[PDB]
Short mmCIF file of N, CA, C and O and ligand atoms in Angstrom, two decimals:
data_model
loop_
_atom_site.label_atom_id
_atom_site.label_comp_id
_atom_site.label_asym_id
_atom_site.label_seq_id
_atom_site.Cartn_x
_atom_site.Cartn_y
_atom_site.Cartn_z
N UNK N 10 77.95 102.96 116.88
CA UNK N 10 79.05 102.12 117.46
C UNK N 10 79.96 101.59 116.33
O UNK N 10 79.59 100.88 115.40
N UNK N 11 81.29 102.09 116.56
CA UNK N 11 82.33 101.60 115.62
C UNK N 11 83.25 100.81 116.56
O UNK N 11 83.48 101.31 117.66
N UNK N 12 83.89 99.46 116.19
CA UNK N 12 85.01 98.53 116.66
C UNK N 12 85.82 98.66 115.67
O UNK N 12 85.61 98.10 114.59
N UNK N 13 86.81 99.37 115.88
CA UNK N 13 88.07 99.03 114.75
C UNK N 13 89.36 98.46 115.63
O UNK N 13 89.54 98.99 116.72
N UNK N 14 90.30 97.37 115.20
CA UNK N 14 91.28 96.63 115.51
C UNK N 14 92.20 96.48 114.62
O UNK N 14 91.96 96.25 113.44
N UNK N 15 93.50 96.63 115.18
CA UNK N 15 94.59 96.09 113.99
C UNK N 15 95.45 95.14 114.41
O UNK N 15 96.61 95.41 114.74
N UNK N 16 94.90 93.83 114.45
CA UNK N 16 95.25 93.19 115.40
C UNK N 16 96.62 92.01 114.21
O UNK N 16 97.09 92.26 113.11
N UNK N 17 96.82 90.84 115.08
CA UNK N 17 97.55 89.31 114.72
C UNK N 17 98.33 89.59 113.56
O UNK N 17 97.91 89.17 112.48
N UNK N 18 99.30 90.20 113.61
CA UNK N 18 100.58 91.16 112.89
C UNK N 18 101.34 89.74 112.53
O UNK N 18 101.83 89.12 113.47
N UNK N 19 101.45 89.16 111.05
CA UNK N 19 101.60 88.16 110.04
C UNK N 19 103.00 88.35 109.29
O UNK N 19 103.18 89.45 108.76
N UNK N 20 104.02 87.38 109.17
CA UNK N 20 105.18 87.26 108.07
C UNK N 20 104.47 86.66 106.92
O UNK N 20 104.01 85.52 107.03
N UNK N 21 104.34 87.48 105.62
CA UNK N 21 103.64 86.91 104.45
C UNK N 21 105.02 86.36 103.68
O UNK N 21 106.12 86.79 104.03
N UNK N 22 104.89 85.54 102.77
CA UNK N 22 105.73 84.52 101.90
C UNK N 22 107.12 84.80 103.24
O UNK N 22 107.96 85.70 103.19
N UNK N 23 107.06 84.30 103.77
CA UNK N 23 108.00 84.01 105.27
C UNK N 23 109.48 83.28 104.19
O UNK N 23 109.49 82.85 103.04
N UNK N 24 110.56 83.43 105.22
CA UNK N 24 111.75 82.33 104.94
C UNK N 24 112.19 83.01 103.28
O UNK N 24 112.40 82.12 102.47
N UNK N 25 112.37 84.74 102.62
CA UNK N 25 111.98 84.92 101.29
C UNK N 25 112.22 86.17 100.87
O UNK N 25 111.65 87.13 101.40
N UNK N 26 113.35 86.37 99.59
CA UNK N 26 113.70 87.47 99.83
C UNK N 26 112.57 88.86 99.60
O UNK N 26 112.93 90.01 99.38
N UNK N 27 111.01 88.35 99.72
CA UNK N 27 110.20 89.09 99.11
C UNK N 27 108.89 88.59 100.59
O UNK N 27 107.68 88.36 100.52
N UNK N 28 109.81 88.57 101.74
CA UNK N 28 108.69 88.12 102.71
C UNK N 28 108.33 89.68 103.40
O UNK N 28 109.24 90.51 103.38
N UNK N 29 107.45 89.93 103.79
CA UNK N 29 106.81 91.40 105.03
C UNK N 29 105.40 90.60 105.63
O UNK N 29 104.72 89.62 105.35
N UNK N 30 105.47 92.11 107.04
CA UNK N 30 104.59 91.54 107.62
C UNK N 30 103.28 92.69 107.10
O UNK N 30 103.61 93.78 106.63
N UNK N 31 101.72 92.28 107.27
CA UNK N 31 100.56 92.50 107.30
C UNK N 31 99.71 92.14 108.39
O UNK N 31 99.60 91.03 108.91
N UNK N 32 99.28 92.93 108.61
CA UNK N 32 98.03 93.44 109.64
C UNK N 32 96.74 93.28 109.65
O UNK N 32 96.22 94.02 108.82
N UNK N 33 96.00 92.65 110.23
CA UNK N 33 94.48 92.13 109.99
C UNK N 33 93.59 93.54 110.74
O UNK N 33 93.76 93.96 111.89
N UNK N 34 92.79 93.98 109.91
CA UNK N 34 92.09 95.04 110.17
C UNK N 34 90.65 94.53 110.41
O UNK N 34 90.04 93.93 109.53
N UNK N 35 90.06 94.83 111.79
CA UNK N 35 88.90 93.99 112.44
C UNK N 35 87.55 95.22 112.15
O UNK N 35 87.68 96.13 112.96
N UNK N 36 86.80 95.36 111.56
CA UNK N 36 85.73 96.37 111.67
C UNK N 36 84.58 95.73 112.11
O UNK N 36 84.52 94.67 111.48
N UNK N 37 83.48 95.85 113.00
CA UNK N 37 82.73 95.66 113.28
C UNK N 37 81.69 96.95 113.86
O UNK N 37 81.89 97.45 114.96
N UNK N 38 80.64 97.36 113.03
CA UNK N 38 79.84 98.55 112.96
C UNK N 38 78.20 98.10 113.06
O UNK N 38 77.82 96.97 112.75
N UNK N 39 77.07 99.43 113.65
CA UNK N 39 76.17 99.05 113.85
C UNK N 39 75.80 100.27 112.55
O UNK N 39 74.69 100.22 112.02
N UNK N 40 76.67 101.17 112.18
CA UNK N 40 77.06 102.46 111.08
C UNK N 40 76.73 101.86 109.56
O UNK N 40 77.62 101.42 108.83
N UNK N 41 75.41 101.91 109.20
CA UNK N 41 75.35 101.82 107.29
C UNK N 41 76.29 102.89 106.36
O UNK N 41 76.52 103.13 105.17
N UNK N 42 76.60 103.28 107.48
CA UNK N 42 78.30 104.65 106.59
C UNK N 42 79.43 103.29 105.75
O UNK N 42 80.32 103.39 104.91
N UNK N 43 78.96 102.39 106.30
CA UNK N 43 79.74 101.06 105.70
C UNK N 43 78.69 100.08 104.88
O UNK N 43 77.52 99.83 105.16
N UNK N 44 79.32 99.72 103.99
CA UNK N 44 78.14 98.73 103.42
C UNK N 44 78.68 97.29 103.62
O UNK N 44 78.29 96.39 102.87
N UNK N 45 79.40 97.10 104.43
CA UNK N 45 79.66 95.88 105.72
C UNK N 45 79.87 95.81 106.63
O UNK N 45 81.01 96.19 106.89
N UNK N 46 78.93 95.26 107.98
CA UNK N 46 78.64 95.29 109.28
C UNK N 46 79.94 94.79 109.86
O UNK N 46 80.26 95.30 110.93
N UNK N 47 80.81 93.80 109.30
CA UNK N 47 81.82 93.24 110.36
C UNK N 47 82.68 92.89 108.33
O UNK N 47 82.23 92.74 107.19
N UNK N 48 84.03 92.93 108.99
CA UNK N 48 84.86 93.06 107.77
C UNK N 48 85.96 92.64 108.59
O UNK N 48 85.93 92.92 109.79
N UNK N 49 87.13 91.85 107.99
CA UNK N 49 88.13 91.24 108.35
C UNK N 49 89.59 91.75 106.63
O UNK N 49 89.40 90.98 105.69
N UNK N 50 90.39 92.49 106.44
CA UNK N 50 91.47 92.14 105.41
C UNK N 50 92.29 92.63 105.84
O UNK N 50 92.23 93.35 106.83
N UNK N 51 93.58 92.27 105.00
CA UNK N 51 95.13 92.42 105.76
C UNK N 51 95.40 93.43 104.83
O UNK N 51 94.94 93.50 103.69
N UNK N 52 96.35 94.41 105.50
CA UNK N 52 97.07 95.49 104.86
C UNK N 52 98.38 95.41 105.49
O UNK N 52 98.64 94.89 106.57
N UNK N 53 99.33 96.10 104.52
CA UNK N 53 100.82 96.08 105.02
C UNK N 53 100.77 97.51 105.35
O UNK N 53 99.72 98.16 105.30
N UNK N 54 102.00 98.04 105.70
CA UNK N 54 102.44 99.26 106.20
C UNK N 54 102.60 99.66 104.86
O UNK N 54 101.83 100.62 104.82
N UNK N 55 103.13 99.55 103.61
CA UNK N 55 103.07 100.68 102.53
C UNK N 55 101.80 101.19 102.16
O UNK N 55 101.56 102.37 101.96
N UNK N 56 100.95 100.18 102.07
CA UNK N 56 99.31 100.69 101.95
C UNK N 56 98.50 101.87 102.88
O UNK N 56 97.80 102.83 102.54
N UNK N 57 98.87 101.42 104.09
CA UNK N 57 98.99 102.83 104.98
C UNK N 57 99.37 104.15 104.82
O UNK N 57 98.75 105.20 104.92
N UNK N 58 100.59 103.87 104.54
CA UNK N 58 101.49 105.25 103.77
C UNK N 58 100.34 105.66 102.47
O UNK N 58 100.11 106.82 102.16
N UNK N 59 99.86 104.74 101.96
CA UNK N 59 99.33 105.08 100.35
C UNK N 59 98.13 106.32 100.89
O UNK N 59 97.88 107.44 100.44
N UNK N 60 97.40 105.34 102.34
CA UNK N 60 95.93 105.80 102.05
C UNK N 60 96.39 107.37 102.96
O UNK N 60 95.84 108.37 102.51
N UNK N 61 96.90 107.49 103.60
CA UNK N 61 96.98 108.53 104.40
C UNK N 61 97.59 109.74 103.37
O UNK N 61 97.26 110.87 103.73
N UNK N 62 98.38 109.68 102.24
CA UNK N 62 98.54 110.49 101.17
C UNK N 62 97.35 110.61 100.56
O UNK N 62 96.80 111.69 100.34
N UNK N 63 96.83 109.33 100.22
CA UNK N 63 95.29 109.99 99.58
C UNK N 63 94.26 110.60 100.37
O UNK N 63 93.41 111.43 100.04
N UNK N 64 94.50 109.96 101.68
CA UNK N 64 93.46 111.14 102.38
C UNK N 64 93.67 112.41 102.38
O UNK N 64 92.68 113.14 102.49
N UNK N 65 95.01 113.01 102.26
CA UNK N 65 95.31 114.35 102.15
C UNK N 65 95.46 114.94 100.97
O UNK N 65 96.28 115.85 100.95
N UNK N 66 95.06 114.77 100.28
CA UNK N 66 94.94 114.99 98.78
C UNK N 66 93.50 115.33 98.67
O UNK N 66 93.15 116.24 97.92
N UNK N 67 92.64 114.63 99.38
CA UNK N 67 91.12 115.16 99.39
C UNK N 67 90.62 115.47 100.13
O UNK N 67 89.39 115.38 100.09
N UNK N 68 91.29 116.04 101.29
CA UNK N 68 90.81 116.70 102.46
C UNK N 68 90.85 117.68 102.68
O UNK N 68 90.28 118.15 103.67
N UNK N 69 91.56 118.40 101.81
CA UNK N 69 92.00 120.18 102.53
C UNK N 69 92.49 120.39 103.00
O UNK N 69 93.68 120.27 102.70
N UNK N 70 92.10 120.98 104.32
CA UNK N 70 92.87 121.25 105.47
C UNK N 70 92.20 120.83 106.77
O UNK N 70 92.17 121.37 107.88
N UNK N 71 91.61 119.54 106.24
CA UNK N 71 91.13 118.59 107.70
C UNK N 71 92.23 118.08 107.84
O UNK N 71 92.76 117.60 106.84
N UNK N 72 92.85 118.03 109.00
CA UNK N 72 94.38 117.40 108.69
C UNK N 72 94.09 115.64 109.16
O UNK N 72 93.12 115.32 109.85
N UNK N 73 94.99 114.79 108.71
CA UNK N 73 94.92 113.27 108.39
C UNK N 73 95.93 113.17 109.94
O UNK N 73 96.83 114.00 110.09
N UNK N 74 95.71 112.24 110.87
CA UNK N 74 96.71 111.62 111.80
C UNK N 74 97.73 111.01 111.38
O UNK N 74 97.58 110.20 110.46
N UNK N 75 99.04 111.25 111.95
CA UNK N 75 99.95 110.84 111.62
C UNK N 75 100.42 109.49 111.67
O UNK N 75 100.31 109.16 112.85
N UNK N 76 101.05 108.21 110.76
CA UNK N 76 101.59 107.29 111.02
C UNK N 76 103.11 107.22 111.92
O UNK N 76 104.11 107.95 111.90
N UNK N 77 102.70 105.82 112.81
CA UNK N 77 103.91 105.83 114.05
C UNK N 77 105.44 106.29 113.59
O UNK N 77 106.25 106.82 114.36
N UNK N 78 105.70 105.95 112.06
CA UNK N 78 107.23 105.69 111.23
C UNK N 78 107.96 104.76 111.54
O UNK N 78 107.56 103.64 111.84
N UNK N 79 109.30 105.19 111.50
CA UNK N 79 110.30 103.98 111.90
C UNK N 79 111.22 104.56 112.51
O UNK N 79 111.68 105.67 112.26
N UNK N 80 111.62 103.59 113.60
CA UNK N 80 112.28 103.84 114.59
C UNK N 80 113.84 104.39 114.85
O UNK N 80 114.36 103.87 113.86
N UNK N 81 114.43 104.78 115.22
CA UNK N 81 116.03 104.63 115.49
C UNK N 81 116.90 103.93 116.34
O UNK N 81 118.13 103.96 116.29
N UNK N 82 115.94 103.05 117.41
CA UNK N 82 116.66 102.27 118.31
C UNK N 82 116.54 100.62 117.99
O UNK N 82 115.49 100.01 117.80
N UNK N 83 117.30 100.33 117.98
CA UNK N 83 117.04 98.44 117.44
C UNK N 83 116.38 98.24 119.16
O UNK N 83 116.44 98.93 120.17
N UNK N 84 115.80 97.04 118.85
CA UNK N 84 115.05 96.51 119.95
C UNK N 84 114.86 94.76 118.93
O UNK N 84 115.32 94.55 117.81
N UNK N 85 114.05 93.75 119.80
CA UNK N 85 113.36 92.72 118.80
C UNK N 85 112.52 93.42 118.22
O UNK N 85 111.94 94.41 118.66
N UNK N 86 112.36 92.64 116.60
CA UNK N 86 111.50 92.42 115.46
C UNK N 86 110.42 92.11 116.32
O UNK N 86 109.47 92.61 115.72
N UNK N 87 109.90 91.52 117.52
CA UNK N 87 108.67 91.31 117.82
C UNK N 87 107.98 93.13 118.73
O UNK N 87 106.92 93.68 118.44
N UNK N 88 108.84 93.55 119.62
CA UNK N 88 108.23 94.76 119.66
C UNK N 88 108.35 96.10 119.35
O UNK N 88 107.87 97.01 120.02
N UNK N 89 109.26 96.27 117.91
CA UNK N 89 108.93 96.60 116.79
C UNK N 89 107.43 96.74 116.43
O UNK N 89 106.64 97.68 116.57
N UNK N 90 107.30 95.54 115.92
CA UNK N 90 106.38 95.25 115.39
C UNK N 90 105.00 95.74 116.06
O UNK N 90 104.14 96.36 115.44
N UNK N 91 104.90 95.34 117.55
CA UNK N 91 104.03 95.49 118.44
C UNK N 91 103.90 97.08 119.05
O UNK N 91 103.06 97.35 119.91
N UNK N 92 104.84 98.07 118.52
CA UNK N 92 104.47 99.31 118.86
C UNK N 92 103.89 99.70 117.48
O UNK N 92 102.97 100.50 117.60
N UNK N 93 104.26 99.26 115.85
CA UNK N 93 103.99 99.27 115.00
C UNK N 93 102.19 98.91 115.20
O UNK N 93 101.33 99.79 115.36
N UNK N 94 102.05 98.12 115.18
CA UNK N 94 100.52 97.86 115.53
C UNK N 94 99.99 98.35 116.30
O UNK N 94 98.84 98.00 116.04
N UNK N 95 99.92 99.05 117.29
CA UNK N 95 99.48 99.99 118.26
C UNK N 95 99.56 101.41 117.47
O UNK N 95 98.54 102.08 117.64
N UNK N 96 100.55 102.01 116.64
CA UNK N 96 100.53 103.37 115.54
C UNK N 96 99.38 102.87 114.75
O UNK N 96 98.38 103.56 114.95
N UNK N 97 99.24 102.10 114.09
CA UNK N 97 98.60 101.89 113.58
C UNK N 97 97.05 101.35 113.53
O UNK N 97 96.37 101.13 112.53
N UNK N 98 96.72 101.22 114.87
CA UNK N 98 95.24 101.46 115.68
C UNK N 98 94.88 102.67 116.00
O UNK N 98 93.69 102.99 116.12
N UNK N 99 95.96 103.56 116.18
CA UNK N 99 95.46 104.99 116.97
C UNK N 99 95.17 105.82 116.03
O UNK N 99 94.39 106.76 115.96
N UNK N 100 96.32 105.07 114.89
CA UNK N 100 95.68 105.73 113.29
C UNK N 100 94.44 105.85 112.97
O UNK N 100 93.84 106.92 113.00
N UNK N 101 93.96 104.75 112.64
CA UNK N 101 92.54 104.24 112.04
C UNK N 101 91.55 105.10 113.20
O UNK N 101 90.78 105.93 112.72
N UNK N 102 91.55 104.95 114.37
CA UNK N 102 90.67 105.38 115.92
C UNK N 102 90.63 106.77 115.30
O UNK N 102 89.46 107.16 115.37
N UNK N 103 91.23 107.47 114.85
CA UNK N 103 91.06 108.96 114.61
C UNK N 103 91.05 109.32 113.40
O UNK N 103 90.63 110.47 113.26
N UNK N 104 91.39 108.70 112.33
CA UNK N 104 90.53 108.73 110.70
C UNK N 104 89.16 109.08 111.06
O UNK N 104 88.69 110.20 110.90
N UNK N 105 88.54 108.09 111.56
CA UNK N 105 87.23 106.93 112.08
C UNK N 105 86.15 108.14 112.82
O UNK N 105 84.96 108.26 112.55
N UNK N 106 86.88 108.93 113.77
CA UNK N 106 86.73 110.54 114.54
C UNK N 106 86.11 111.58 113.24
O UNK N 106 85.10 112.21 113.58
N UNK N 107 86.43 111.74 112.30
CA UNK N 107 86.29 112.70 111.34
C UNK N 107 85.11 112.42 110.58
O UNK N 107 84.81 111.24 110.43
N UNK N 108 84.51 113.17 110.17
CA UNK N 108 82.99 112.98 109.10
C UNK N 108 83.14 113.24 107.96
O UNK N 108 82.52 112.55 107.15
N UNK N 109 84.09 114.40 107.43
CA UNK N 109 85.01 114.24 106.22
C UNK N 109 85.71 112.94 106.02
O UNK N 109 85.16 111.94 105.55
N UNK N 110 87.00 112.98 106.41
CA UNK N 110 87.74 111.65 106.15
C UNK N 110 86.49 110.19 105.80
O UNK N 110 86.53 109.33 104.91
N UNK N 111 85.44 110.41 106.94
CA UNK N 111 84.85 108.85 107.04
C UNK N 111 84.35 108.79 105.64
O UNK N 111 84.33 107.68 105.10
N UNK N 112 83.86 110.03 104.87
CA UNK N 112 83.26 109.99 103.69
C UNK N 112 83.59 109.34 102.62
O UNK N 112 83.02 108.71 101.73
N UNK N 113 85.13 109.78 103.05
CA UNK N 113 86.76 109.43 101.51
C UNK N 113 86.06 107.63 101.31
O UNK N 113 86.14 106.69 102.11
N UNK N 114 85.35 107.68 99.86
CA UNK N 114 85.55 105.84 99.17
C UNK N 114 86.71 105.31 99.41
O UNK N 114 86.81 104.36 100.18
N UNK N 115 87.79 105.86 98.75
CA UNK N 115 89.09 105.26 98.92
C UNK N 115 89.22 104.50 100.87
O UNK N 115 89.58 103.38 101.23
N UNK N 116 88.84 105.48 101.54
CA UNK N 116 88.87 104.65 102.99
C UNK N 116 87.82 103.67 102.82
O UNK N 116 87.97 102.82 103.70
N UNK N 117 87.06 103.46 102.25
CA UNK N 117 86.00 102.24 102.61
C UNK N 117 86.21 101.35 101.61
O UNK N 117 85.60 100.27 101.66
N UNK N 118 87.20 101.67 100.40
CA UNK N 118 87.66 99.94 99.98
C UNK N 118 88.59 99.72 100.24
O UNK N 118 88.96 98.76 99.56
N UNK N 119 89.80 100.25 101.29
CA UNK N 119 91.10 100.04 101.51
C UNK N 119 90.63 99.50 102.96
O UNK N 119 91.45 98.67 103.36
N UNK N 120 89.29 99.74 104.12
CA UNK N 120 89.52 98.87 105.07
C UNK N 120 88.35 97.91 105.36
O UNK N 120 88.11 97.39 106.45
N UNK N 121 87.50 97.71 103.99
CA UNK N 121 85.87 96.69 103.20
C UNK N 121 86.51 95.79 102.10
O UNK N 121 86.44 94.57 102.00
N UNK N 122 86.98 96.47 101.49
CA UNK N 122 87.43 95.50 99.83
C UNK N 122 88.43 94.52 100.10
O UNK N 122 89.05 94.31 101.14
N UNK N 123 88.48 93.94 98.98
CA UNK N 123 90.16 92.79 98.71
C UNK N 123 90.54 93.62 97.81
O UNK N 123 91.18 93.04 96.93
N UNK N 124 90.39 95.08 97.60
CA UNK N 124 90.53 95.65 96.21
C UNK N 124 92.18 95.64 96.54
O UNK N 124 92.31 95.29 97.71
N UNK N 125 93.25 95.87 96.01
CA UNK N 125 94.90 95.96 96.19
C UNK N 125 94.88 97.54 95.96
O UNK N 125 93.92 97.88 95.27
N UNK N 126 95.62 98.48 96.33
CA UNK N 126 95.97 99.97 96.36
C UNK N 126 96.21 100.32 94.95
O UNK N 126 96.18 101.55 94.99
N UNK N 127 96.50 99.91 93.42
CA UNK N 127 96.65 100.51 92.27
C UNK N 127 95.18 100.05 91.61
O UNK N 127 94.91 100.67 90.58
N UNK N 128 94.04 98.91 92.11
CA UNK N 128 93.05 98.83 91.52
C UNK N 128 91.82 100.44 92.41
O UNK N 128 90.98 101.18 91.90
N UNK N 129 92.35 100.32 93.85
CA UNK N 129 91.49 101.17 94.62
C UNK N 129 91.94 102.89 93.31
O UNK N 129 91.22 103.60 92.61
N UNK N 130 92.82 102.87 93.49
CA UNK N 130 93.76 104.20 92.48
C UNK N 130 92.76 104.40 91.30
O UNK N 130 91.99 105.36 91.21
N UNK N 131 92.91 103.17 90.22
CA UNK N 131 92.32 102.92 89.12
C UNK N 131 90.65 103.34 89.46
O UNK N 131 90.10 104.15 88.70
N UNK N 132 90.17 102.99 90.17
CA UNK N 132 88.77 102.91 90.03
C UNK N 132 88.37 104.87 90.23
O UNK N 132 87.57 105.48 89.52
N UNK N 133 88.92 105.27 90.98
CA UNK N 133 89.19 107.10 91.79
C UNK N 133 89.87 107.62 90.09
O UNK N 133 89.44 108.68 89.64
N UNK N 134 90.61 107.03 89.49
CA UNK N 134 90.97 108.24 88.05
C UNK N 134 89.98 107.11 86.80
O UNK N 134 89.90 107.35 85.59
N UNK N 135 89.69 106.58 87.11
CA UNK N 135 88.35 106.20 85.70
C UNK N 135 86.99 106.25 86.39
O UNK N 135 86.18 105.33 86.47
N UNK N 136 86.91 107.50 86.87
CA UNK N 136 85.34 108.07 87.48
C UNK N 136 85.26 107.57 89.01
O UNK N 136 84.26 107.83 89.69
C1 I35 C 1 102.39 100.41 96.47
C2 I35 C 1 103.82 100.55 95.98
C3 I35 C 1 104.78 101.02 97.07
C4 I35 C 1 106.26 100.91 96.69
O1 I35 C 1 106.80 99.89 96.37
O2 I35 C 1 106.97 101.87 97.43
C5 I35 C 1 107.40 101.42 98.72
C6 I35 C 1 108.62 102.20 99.19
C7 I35 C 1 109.13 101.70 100.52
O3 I35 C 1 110.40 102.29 100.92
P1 I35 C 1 110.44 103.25 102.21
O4 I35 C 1 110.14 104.66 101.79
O5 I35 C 1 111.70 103.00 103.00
O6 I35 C 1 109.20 102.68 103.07
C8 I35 C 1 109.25 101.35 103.70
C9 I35 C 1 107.96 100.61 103.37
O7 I35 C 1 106.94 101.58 103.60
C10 I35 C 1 107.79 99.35 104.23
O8 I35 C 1 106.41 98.88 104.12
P2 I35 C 1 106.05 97.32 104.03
O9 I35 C 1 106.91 96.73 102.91
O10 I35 C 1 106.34 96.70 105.41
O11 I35 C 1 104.61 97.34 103.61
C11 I35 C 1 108.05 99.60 105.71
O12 I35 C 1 108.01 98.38 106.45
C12 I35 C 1 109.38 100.27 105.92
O13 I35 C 1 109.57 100.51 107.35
P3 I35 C 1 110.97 100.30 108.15
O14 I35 C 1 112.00 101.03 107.30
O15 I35 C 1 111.32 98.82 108.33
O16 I35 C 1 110.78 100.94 109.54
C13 I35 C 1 109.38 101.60 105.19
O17 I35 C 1 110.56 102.35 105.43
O18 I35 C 1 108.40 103.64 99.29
C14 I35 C 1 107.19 104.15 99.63
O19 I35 C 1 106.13 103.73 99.23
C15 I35 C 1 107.26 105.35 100.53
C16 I35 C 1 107.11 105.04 101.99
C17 I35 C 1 107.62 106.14 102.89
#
């Protein structure tokens, strides 16, 4: 049994010319494929972009699910956002599907760690 969620979609440093939003990623597993049963950290949408390049970089030709992108029709910033978070559940739901992919480290400190995406990098090219 795997619970994955990408839920309560966040304005970080808000009011700023350096504000975005992040995504709380909910794991809750009965799976020692994790070496944490229930895990809570926020990721933005570039980190997404990061890990789904690195998943394909070590996968072959298991192919990686695609992220939702960005849109062409203005609508509100709130459901934006809210189809954004829904791409980005159906994402993870089908990583999560694969026994290759589930293997990739890089996926288990990008949705377990506080590690940031150039330390997860660092640790994959120094062994
Ligand atoms: C870790 C260092 C990353 C770095 O600073 O680069 C980021 C840069 C972004 O430039 P760009 O290629 O335009 O990519 C943008 C960022 O990925 C941004 O992520 P975030 O800031 O929300 O996390 C999205 O919100 C934005 O979506 P939209 O346009 O509003 O629909 C998207 O276009 O380009 C990319 O990484 C390629 C993404 C396709």
């Amino acid at each position: 049994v795997i619970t994955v969620r990408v839920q309560d979609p966040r304005v970080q440093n808000e009011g700023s010319w350096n504000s975005y939003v992040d995504y709380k990623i909910f794991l809750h597993t009965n799976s020692k494929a994790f070496t944490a049963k229930t895990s809570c950290v926020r990721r933005r949408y570039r980190e997404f972009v990061w890990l789904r390049k690195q998943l394909q970089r070590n996968a072959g030709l298991v192919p990686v699910p695609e992220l939702p992108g960005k849109s062409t029709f203005f609508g509100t910033s709130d459901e934006f956002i809210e189809k954004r978070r829904q791409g980005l559940q159906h994402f993870l739901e089908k990583v999560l599907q694969s026994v290759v992919l589930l293997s990739d480290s890089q996926l288990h400190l990008f949705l377990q760690s506080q590690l940031s995406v150039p330390e997860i990098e660092a640790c994959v090219q120094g062994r």
